[PDB]
Amino acid sequence: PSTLIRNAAAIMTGGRGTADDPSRVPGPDIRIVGDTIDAIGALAPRPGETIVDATDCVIYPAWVNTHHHLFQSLLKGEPFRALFDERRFRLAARIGLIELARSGCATVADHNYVYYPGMPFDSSAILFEEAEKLGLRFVLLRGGATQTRQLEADLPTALRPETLDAYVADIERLAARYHDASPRAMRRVVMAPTTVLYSISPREMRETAAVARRLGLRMHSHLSGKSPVAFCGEHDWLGSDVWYAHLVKVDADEIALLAQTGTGVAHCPQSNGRLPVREMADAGVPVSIGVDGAASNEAADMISEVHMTWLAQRARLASIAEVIHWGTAGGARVMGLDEVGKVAVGYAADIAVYRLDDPRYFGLHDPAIGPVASGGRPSVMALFSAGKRVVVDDLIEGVDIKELGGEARRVVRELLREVVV
């Protein structure tokens, strides 16, 4: 159980780029023993060891997606939810998970909120099952609401809120069943009421925070008396413990509070368009990257996202390393997976090896920059998750692309037919 990635053209560390924490390590080979990075730079092969020739290839740490809505992978077009079932939910998750894996992402976090009294299937179960079939680390962001006042009788089974205790109960169940607290867990669970300032009562967000903290879990939510951030603070919803998605429009005072509390953000540019950053980053608040639900982001893969992130940061005249950090080690520390997100000895072996065999890369003075700046989608000759090869030249064990294609095309038709009713 040893492997040697040899002769890499470039190696980005996902580091903050300082002298203490370098963003690029000019070194050439990488040894992996088990699930850990054993060494970096000038290594001689070993007898019977596995060898992967990364000649002309660029190495990056696998991506860490900190926000998503996988069911939406079958709702790509526009904004249905009540029509999801066993088969379907499973398909949407597989699809989005697959396209995420071939974009070099090894750690996915889904803000799942399909839950309702009497649901015939276990969403959470399905999500962890699929993630693992692919060999990916999964982070469950158990979402939901206790209110809605769209009323009720004019709301079907699927869209009805869950009583506060039902929610809490479920999380304890999930916390005990799947959550591993190591900083390199392959499974995680977090307290994530959809839009905390709406999905739940403010008295409920306090108690809801207490349970999460009591179970040693992190908190996450969509952040749409006084200021929103200031309100969250007053209801036990800030701290390096918590991180928010979709937080566009933020006061200077609000940024400071995020900076002092250590509350992170899940930056989603492509999605946020259908609706800042380097101020929060400068303020010191942790920044991570996510792509949420194909319903708001048709290009739900970490490469398209990272590309948009970089371009938008160039708009305000923001390096590639800067962004690679956000998409890797930055997201890891936001979700508490501290031994993940860095191509450094001692860390978990989650590595992406890209082959720039596409003409868009032909002519790059710094070929290392390609995966983020060239657009398109580099060829994953190799993806490693916990030291295991999940991808071999864009191929994943268990996936038949044409097959998966036909399935989705069929379900979408069914879906489209059914909404008419």
Residue 225 DSSP symbol: -
- Among 292, 301, 322, 350, the residue binding Zn ion under the rule CB under 5 A is 292
Shortest reach from residue 197's CB to Zn ion, in Å = 14
110 binds Zn ion (CB under 5 A): no
Helix H or strand E encompassing 378:
none
What does DSSP say about strands 242-245 and 218-222: parallel, antiparallel, or unpaired?
parallel
Touching Zn ion, residues 119-178 (CB under 5 A): none
Helix H or strand E encompassing 220:
strand 218-222
Q: Which is nearer to Zn ion, 10 or 200 (CB)?
A: 200
Would you say 293 and 300 are in contact if contact means Cβ atoms under 8 Å apart?
A: yes
Q: Which is nearer to Zn ion, 204 or 292 (CB)?
A: 292
Shortest reach from residue 289's CB to Zn ion, in Å = 13
Nearest Cα neighbor of 306 from 238, 225, 361, 378 is 378
Question: What is the number of residues in the chain?
Answer: 421
Q: Which residues, at least 6 apart from 268, have a Cβ–Cβ distance to it below 8 Å?
A: 67, 245, 246, 289, 290, 291, 292, 297, 305
Please give the sequence-ordered ranges of beta strands (E in DSSP) within 319-365, or none if there are none. 351-355
Q: Which is nearer to Zn ion, 236 or 292 (CB)?
A: 292
Give me the residue whose beta carbon is nearest to Zn ion: 292
* Tokens standing for residue 153: 């009788």
Would you say 271 and 294 are in contact if contact means Cβ atoms under 8 Å apart?
A: no
Task: Give how far Cα 367 sits from Cα of 57, 355, 380, Å.
Answer: 9, 10, 15
The letter for the amino acid at 346 is G
Would you say 287 and 336 are in contact if contact means Cβ atoms under 8 Å apart?
A: no
Binding residues for Zn ion, rule CB under 5 A, total 1
Residue given tokens 């009591």 in the structure block: 214
Shortest reach from residue 157's CB to Zn ion, in Å = 23
Q: Which is nearer to Zn ion, 36 or 195 (CB)?
A: 195
Q: Which is nearer to Zn ion, 29 or 292 (CB)?
A: 292
Nearest Cα neighbor of 123 from 96, 142, 99, 147 is 142
- Which span sits near Zn ion by CB under 5 A: 258-266, 288-296, 325-333, 334-342? 288-296
Q: Which is nearer to Zn ion, 81 or 360 (CB)?
A: 81
Q: Which is nearer to Zn ion, 109 or 324 (CB)?
A: 109
- Which span sits near Zn ion by CB under 5 A: 292-300, 320-328, 331-339, 383-391? 292-300
Shortest reach from residue 305's CB to Zn ion, in Å = 13
Task: Give how far Cα 386 sits from Cα of 8, 128, 350, Å.
Answer: 20, 16, 6
Q: Which is nearer to Zn ion, 194 or 385 (CB)?
A: 194
Shortest reach from residue 313's CB to Zn ion, in Å = 21
Would you say 179 and 187 are in contact if contact means Cβ atoms under 8 Å apart?
A: yes
Q: Which is nearer to Zn ion, 292 or 322 (CB)?
A: 292
- For residue 165, the SS3 value is helix
- Which span sits near Zn ion by CB under 5 A: 18-26, 85-93, 198-206, 291-299? 291-299
- For residue 287, the SS3 value is strand
Shortest reach from residue 294's CB to Zn ion, in Å = 11
Shortest reach from residue 242's CB to Zn ion, in Å = 16
Shortest reach from residue 68's CB to Zn ion, in Å = 7
- Which span sits near Zn ion by CB under 5 A: 99-107, 125-133, 256-264, 286-294? 286-294
- Residue 251 — φ and ψ, nearest 5°? -55, 165
- Which span sits near Zn ion by CB under 5 A: 1-9, 131-139, 191-199, 289-297? 289-297
Q: Which is nearer to Zn ion, 268 or 396 (CB)?
A: 268
Shortest reach from residue 248's CB to Zn ion, in Å = 12
Rounded Cα gap, residues 113 and 70, in angstroms? 10
Shortest reach from residue 178's CB to Zn ion, in Å = 22
- Which span sits near Zn ion by CB under 5 A: 1-9, 275-283, 285-293, 348-356? 285-293
Q: Please give the residue ranges that form the binding site for Zn ion (CB under 5 A).
A: 292
